[PDB]
């Protein structure tokens, strides 16, 4: 019964699913409803992470914290670096169906204690989800953002373009809490993204910049980070 065409979201579903749990042993449970995660292109940022964060030697060996912002009903991102590398995610959510499936997706891996999944008012984003955090610096904040149409025919080519101005906003909080985060990272979907957003840093003088490209076969997607330490 299970659909054998992949342009079919039961058959990306299905994959992704038994993907996880055969590499990974991750059961998840996701609606049709919200973006069916991709595992190859999920990893690939995850790595890049693992690199922008640094490797560390036995003796200096730490828990190291990220912010998830948008987790999705997967909660993909958190599941993830917390089953490889050990990681501890604070997973942010405004959706209800997101959040509720999230945090239930995390319950049933029992990761509740690596994985602190929030739901967060629409206004926010960083700055609010980390009120009065004193005590510890994130190593980073990773981020697969919504396609809101502002926030009609040409609605999709609108909502795509809606991604700029979303990482906008997390260059925004980024600017106020500048060092509280080690690394600010976004993923983006056009290439055309990147020009813009590259010179809204540099206008900023924020210090470190720095991007990528993944690639999986015909999904081609790029990665930007900025740090305020020297
Ligand atoms: N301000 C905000 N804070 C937290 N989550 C937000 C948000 N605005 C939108 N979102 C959520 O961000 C998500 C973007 S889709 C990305 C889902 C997941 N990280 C993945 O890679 O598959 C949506 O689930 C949306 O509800």
């Not at 509740?112 to 929030?118: A, Q, R, Y």
């Not at 910049?209 to 990665?223: D, I, K, L, N, P």
Request: aromatic share 10%.
């Amino acid at each position: 019964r299970v659909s054998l065409n992949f342009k079919d979201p039961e058959a990306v579903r299905a994959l992704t699913c038994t993907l996880l749990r055969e590499d990974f042993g991750l059961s998840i449970d996701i609606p049709l409803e919200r973006l069916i995660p991709t595992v190859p292109l999920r990893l690939n940022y995850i790595h890049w992470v693992e690199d922008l964060i640094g490797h560390q030697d036995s003796d200096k060996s730490t828990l190291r914290r990220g912010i998830d912002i948008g987790t999705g009903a997967s909660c993909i991102y958190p599941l993830l670096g917390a089953t490889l590398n050990g990681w501890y995610f604070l997973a942010t959510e405004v959706d209800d169906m997101c959040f509720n499936y999230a945090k239930k997706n995390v319950e049933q891996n029992n990761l509740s204690d690596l994985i602190k999944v929030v739901k967060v008012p629409q206004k926010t984003l960083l700055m609010d989800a980390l009120k009065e955090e004193s005590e510890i610096i994130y190593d980073f904040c990773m981020c697969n953002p919504p396609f809101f149409a502002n926030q009609g025919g040409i609605t999709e080519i609108m909502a795509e373009g809606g991604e700029l101005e979303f990482v906008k906003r997390i260059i925004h909080d980024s600017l106020q809490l500048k060092k509280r985060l080690r690394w600010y990272s976004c993923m983006l979907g056009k290439k055309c993204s990147l020009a813009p957003l590259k010179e809204e840093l540099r206008i900023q003088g924020v210090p470190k910049v720095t991007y990528t490209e993944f690639c999986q076969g015909r999904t081609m997607r790029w990665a930007l980070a900025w740090s305020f330490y020297d």
